[PDB]
Structure 1
Amino acid sequence: QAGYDLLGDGRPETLWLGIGTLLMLIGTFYFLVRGWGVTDKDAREYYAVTILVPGIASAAYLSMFFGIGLTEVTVGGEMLDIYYARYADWLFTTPLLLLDLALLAKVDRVTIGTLVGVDALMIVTGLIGALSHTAIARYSWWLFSTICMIVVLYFLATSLRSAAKERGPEVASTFNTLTALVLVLWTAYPILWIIGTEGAGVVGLGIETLLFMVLDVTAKVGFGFILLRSRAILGDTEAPE
């Protein structure tokens, strides 16, 4: 694979996992330090949710870097590498990102339940795809998972957007900016998966790891940066519980 075998264990992709680890750690510490000087009760909720996003990713990236939770899946002759921690990361962090958006929109607990439920299904069916031993199964689970993603994105772009709008221009502008980012960035994930080692195998494990790393840092640190510098986080929130 494209990269450099940093730890001398036959894995060129550790170059990208190592860089990922550092950027996630730096992002976590940045938000944490900025968080310390925040007193508004609403701002503090946004900081708490948002710090955990690169924080959990940091742990997953460190694990993958050291080769913890790495295994092989047989698809005929081919043995595919699967990093379990990638999926565990996404399981925890995608709901947290959706919670940030739901707090801005100030939607009800049932709406939030639906959003995070379909999101969880997206990730789980992604994992089933990655562990499947035939081509037909892998592509089928990918498609099912992609339909779940579209449902999530549709809810953001319609129901949550309309709710955010009535909270006035500050909240609405921040919501719209973040949703514009999400609609593009999240859609890149299924594309990379199907052209990479898990799908068609046009791109190898090296390039794939690199590009997931860029997506992850943008979707987590980039998202957090835009959110936490907005005045909208001072506005009233109502957590689902």
Structure 2
Amino acid sequence: QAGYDLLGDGRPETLWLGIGTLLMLIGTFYFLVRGWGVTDKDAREYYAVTILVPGIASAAYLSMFFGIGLTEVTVGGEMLDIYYARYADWLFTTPLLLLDLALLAKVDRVTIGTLVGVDALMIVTGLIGALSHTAIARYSWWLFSTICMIVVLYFLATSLRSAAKERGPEVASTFNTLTALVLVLWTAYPILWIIGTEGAGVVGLGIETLLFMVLDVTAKVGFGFILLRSRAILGDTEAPE
């Protein structure tokens, strides 16, 4: 794999996992310190949700860096390297990111349940695909997961967007800016997976880990930076509970 075997354990991708760990930690601490001076009840909710996104990713990236939760999956004569913590991270952080968007939109808890449920199914079926032992199974689960993703993104771009519009220009503009990022950045994930080690195997583990790290840092720290600097986070919220 393209990279550098930092820990001397035969894993050049740890260069990228190490860089990712550091960036997630810096982002977490930045949001934490910024949050300490926040008093508004709504803004505190966005900070709490959003700090946890690179916070949990920090733990996942540190895990992966040290090789905790790394195993191999037999696919014919190949043994594909899978990091469980990548999927565990996404299982927690994608619902949190969607909750941020749902708070902005001020949508109801059944809408939120639908959104986060389909998102969880996306991650679970991606993991099933990653652990599957035939190409046909891996591609089939990938396709199912990708349909789940399209459903999530469609809901964001239609139902939640229309709800956010009613909340006035500040909230609408922030919702729209973040949704623009999400529709593009999230779609990059299935593309990378299917061209990478899990799918067609065009891209190797090194470049793939690098690019997932960039996507993860952008979709977490980048997203969070854009959200938390907006006046929209002062607007009234209704948590699902």
TM-score with structure 2 setting the length: 1.00
TM-superposed CA distance for 1:191, in Å, is 0.2
**Total equivalences in the alignment:** 241
How many angstroms apart in 1 are the aligned matches of 2:169 and 2:76?
A: 55
Cα distance, 1:162 vs structure 2:
0.3
Taking the aligned partners of 2:5 and 2:223, their CA distance within structure 1 comes to: 30
| Structure 2 unaligned blocks of 5 or more | none
1:137-158 deviation per Cα after TM superposition (whole angstroms, max 9, x unaligned)? 0000000000000000000000
Q: Secondary structure at the match of 2:79?
A: strand
SS in 1 for 2:34: helix
Deviation, 1:48, is 0.2
C-alpha deviations, 1:126-177, integer Å up to 9, x for none? 0000000000000000000000000000000000000000100000000000
Q: Deviations over 1:104-136 (max 9, x none)?
A: 000000000000000000000000000000000
Q: Distance in 1 between matches of 2:159 and 2:84?
A: 33
Displacement, 1:234?
Answer: 0.3
Specify the SS of the correspondent of 2:188: helix
* Residues 27-82 of structure 1: per-residue CA shift (max 9 Å, x gap): 00000000000000000000000000000000000000000000000001000000
In structure 1, distance between residues paired with 2:240 and 2:205: 39
Q: Deviation of residue 3 (structure 1)?
A: 0.4
- When the two chains are superposed, the root-mean-square deviation of aligned CA atoms in Å is 0.2
Deviation at 1:213, TM superposition (A): 0.2
Match of 1:74 in 2: 74
Shift of 1:193: 0.1
Distance 1:163 1:92 in 2: 24
Deviation of 1:86 after TM superposition, in Å, equals 0.2
Could you say what secondary structure the match of 2:80 adopts?
strand
Deviations 1:199-241 (A, max 9, x none): 0000000000000000000000000000000000000000011
% same residue: 100
Secondary structure, aligned partner of 2:200: coil
The SS at the match of 2:201 is coil
Secondary structure in 2 aligned to 1:222?
helix
Rounded to whole Å, the distance in 2 between the matches of 1:76 and 1:231 is 54
Partner SS state of residue 48, structure 2: helix
SS state at 1:162 partner: helix
Match of 1:174 in 2: 174
Query: Residue 239 of structure 1 aligns to a residue in which SS?
Result: coil
2: distance between equivalents of 1:74 and 1:172? Answer: 47
Equivalents in 1 of 2:209, 2:191: separation in Å?
A: 13
Distance, in Å, in 2 between the alignment partners of 1:174 and 1:82 is 35
CA distance in 1, matches of 2:107, 2:82: 37
